[PDB]
Design a protein around this nucleic acid. Structure first.
Ligand SMILES: [Zn+2]
Lengths: 23, 206, 126, 114, 96, 83, 155, 60
RNA sequence: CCGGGCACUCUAACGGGACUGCCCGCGAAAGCGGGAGGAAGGAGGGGACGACGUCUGGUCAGCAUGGCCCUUACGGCCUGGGCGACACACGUGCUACAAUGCCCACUACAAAGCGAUGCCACCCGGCAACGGGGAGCUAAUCGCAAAAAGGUGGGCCCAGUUCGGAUUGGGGUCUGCAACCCGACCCCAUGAAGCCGGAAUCGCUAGUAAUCGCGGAUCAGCCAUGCCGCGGUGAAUACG
């Protein structure tokens, strides 16, 4: 869900960047 | 405990700011600071003279100051002595060019602060509060104001039960934006605490 | 020859141009269904060309900015209505009857403090 | 089958690896790369040599089922021994990572007890 | 190139318009006053000093921006440039 | 955790007092306030009463507790249950 | 709702079938204003009904609705110490709403994994006057008919 | 403990992170706007007073 | 992209525009219903605006202030701990319990704001957080910054799951003097409850609800799912 960091969904909701959501 | 402040309600509609000076974020905070000290310093120094308004504009590295007062000589002193004494001490805190100026209060019965200050001094002299109000509102309306109201809150006449007394006269349309309405607050403290004095002077719905 | 209309529908600007021809449609340099691909609603934008039937008559050069595609649609809708009456004032007849030539006043209502949304008051208890 | 457990034949290999304790989505997409195996293949569609290759690779690249759990308990048990606050938290069955014990500690505390 | 920054639009429009007249009197080119978008800066705040978080009040600092530039330098106007009447609610930018 | 690129943080007065006993032989239980400090391998075999906010909790520093902060072992709170 | 009557909104007719009712039935499927998704799911069931029982999807649609449009419904009313259920007629507005609501919800309970099939099966049963949405219309007007003695409690 | 604190905030700390901002007017710690250095209360007060140049009740 | 133009959009100031203005019928009028025009029609939408007073409402901890009260302390400095506990209980929210869905790769489409010791482009390294380079940006021009949902293609096939991310172990980055208590974030693994929720109860009449994302304040960093705003898409229903 939104609260899952490992999903790109999460890093969207969490507003972060990482292995699963680059820039 | 529910109404809005009238002046801020009307800034840039009928009433204008009392400190007009554009500044950047890098300096707006700083110049704002000493602007208060000028309001603070000149307050005590001029209350004896009957201060009304402290307009402060900041030109290039220098603040053109305009005080509105009822006793213009009492501000300047002996032929502008105190004023010359002030801008000395004034710039001592501002550090910039203290352009110190005085402007008479045309019909001082229309200066809600002066109206408030006088009514404060009266009640601070133990005079009849309820009488000072009606008398104060009286000459103001008698001074040509198309409407005026005065309210006082706190321990009235030393009574322990706090109370709010007030007299009104003539139209006082606080809701109407275009009503040129003078507001005046007066901190009036007694031995038995503090009394508040708000002065509403309706002038014109231009 | 060239005929122009504007589109405004909930933050969507739509500059439309009516150059006669076979009815080509361009949205910021793209085909209509091109830029609007996958949009079920994106057929009603060209609807005013069915009130007056110049569908294959006027080639549309259209740009749009701001807001989602949906708002961009109606802006073009109102946009195309503009240049049409620009082309033919008689087109106003049979368009104003369809209200195609009146702007959608509906806009995102301002969000109010004390409210999560424009009117979403937080659930309280007693 | 694999190191300690089996992956369902009807599922793709990617989800297949994940059922191993100590294998999540990350390494699951990795062993396919290091073993060059199609992710889309079902476990029912996996060849022996590919599996044994898979089996040989992954089961030594990491410890997964029992060998992995022991380190956890080893880490956890030693914390109880050292009396660390972390270990202090574990011995109370309380949220060890500074969570708020006053409310919403159910996942660490389970059923509510008036 | 000349920008202007102030809190009032009337003062700016007053002050800026006279500036465009200066080169309009002895210079060129008098690039008209181009009103840039005004950077607004809100301030939500609670009315009361204590609680009642709900009842708020907003504020703003509309720093209106107006820009007039002279195309040709016109150094005769250059002194005319510095010879400007800038009221206290307006600030000036100078470049080209 | 602390950026290992950055140095591994330990208070100066703490470490020096550690090495002093390392110099002058193991002895002299050391009061301390540096809960934020990290145990260092040299600290092993030392005994230190770390301050909890109210008291100095004497904690014997073994090898088993080297890679940690000192505050971990002086619990700054007292809970015994309910009822 | 005291002063005016709060007149209904004029739904924009759908592009495909040029219908407001169709556009109406869309919105009951629409979630979160995700009309594009809901638009397809309808249009997908359009193809399905166009395929399974290949006819006019629109004609099947309206036939489905008319088979499920209720006309008599109970209404709770705490007359005396008894919470009655007065049977009542229905204006075509609420007739359509109840119909549209049921066919969706009945379609929201079939077993098939996707929605447009569920809609397709639903419209198939509905156009056939069968299925839960029909039963609901059957049950309501029956239940509405069960309490016909309470008719005078109407208001 | 206020006056020392509202003076302690003025001096420089042993660590830059200890430098917290109080209202220059009321010395409040919370809701201190960097753009002013004032509390949200003193902001509102001076705002209605019209002393803040440019500031005004925003109503959009 | 450049010359070129200011058309267009926009920007931002000044204006006009909607006033029952006008036609019909109803009424004594007030007005009411309909119509035309009109972008807007009858309070056009939203906002600021909160009367006399009530609540001995709240606040002496924003501030001010009568009085009472401490003066080697109830004052001031420092170090730490506490405010973060935890059997429980309530409120307010967030995330879900999935297929109108989840995940992945590509393509869109905003608004409103912020930024000189800050935005930081772009490069490199690094799974990544991030680090090293490093332009521009003093602001419509530089950047933050990707909007997201959406569309496209693929997988998943109903599964406590490719749902769910809670907890926990480990390995790291960053700020900070210092992230144990007591930060955030990145990576692996762990993968909890949860299959739409009793009694009961809440918000909402339109660009509303719902859902999607964006910005800002405080702030070194952030415990922000909060708050204040911004825009995307976008409902049903009002008989009474
Ligand atoms: Zn303050």
């Amino acid at each position: 869900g939104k609260g899952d960091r490992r999903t790109r969904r999460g890093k969207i909701w969490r507003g972060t960047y990482g292995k699963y959501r680059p820039r | 405990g529910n109404k809005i402040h009238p002046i801020g309600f009307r800034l840039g509609i009928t009433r204008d700011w009392e400190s007009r000076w554009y500044a950047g974020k890098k300096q707006y905070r700083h110049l704002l600071l000493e602007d208060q000290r000028i309001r603070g310093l000149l307050e005590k120094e001029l209350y004896s003279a009957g201060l009304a308004r402290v307009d402060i504009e900041r030109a290039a590295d220098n603040v053109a100051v305009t005080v509105h007062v009822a006793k213009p000589g009492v501000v300047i002193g002996r032929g502008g002595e105190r004023i010359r004494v002030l801008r000395e001490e004034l710039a001592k805190l501002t550090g910039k060019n203290v352009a110190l100026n005085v402007q008479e209060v045309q019909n001082p019965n229309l200066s809600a602060p002066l109206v408030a200050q006088r009514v404060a001094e009266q009640i601070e002299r133990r005079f009849a509060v309820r009488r000072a109000i009606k008398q104060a509102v009286q000459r103001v309306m008698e001074s040509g104001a198309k409407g005026a109201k005065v309210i006082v809150s706190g321990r009235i006449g030393g009574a322990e039960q706090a109370r709010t007394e007030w007299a009104a006269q003539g139209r006082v349309p606080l809701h109407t934006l275009r009503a040129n309405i003078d507001y005046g607050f007066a901190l009036a403290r007694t031995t038995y605490g503090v009394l508040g004095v708000k002065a509403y002077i309706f002038l014109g719905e231009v | 020859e060239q005929y122009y209309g504007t589109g405004r529908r909930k933050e969507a600007v739509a500059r439309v141009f009516l150059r006669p021809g076979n009815g080509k449609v361009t949205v910021n340099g793209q085909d209509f269904n091109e830029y609007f691909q996958g949009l079920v609603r994106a057929v009603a934008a060209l609807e005013p060309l069915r009130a007056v039937d110049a569908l294959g008559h006027f080639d549309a050069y259209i740009t749009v900015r701001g807001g989602g595609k949906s708002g961009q649609i109606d802006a073009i809708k109102l946009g195309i209505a503009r240049a049409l009456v620009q082309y033919n004032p008689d087109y106003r007849a049979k368009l104003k009857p369809l209200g195609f030539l009146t702007r959608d006043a509906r806009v995102v209502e301002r969000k109010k403090y004390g409210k999560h949304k424009a009117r979403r008051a937080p659930q309280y208890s007693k | 089958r694999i190191a300690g457990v089996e992956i369902p034949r009807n599922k793709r290999v990617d989800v297949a690896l994940t059922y191993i304790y100590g294998i999540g989505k990350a390494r699951a997409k990795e062993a396919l790369e290091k073993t060059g195996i199609n992710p889309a293949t079902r476990v029912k569609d996996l060849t022996e040599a590919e599996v044994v290759r898979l089996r040989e690779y992954v089961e030594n690249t990491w410890k997964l089922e029992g060998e992995l759990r022991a380190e956890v308990a080893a880490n956890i048990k030693r914390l109880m021994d050292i009396g660390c606050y972390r270990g202090l938290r574990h011995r109370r069955g309380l949220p060890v990572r500074g969570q708020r014990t006053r409310t919403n500690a159910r996942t660490r505390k389970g059923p509510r007890k008036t | 190139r000349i920008k202007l920054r102030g809190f009032d639009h009337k003062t700016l429009d007053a002050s800026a318009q006279k500036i465009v007249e200066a080169a309009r009197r002895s210079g060129a080119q008098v690039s008209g006053p181009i009103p840039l978008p005004t950077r607004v800066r809100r301030f939500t705040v609670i009315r009361g000093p204590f609680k009642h978080k709900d009842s708020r009040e907003h504020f703003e600092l509309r720093t209106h921006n107006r820009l007039v530039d002279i195309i040709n330098p016109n150094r005769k106007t250059i002194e005319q440039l510095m010879t400007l009447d800038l009221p206290t609610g307006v600030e000036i930018e100078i470049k080209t | 955790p602390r950026s290992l690129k950055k140095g591994v943080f330990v208070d100066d007065h703490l470490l020096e007092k550690v090495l002093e006993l390392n110099a002058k032989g193991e002895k002299r239980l050391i009061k301390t306030w540096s809960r934020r400090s990290t145990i260092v391998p040299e600290m092993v075999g030392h005994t230190i009463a770390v301050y909890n906010g109210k008291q100095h909790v004497p904690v014997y520093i073994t090898e088993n507790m080297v890679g940690h902060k000192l505050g971990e072992f002086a619990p700054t709170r007292t809970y015994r249950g309910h009822g | 709702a005291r002063r005016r009557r709060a007149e209904v909104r004029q739904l924009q007719p759908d592009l495909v079938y040029g219908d407001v009712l169709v556009t109406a039935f869309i919105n009951k499927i629409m979630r979160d204003g995700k009309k594009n998704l809901a638009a397809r799911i309808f249009y997908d069931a359009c193809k399905i009904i166009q395929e399974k029982t290949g006819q006019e999807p629109l004609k099947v649609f309206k036939q489905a609705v008319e088979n499920v449009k209720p006309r008599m419904e109970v209404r709770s009313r705490r007359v005396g110490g008894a919470n009655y259920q007065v049977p009542m007629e229905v204006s075509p507005r609420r007739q359509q709403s109840l119909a549209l609501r049921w066919l969706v919800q009945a379609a929201n309970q079939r077993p098939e994994r996707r929605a447009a099939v569920r809609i397709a099966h639903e419209l198939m049963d509905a156009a056939e006057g069968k299925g839960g949405a029909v039963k609901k219309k059957e049950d309501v007007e029956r239940m509405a008919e069960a309490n016909r003695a309470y008719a005078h409690y109407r208001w | 403990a206020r006056k020392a604190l509202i003076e302690k905030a003025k001096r420089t700390p042993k660590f830059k992170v200890r430098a917290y901002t109080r209202c220059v007017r009321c010395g409040r710690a919370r809701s201190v706007y960097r753009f002013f250095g004032l509390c949200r209360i003193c902001l509102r007060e001076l705002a209605h007073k019209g002393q803040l140049p440019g500031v005004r009740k925003a109503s959009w």
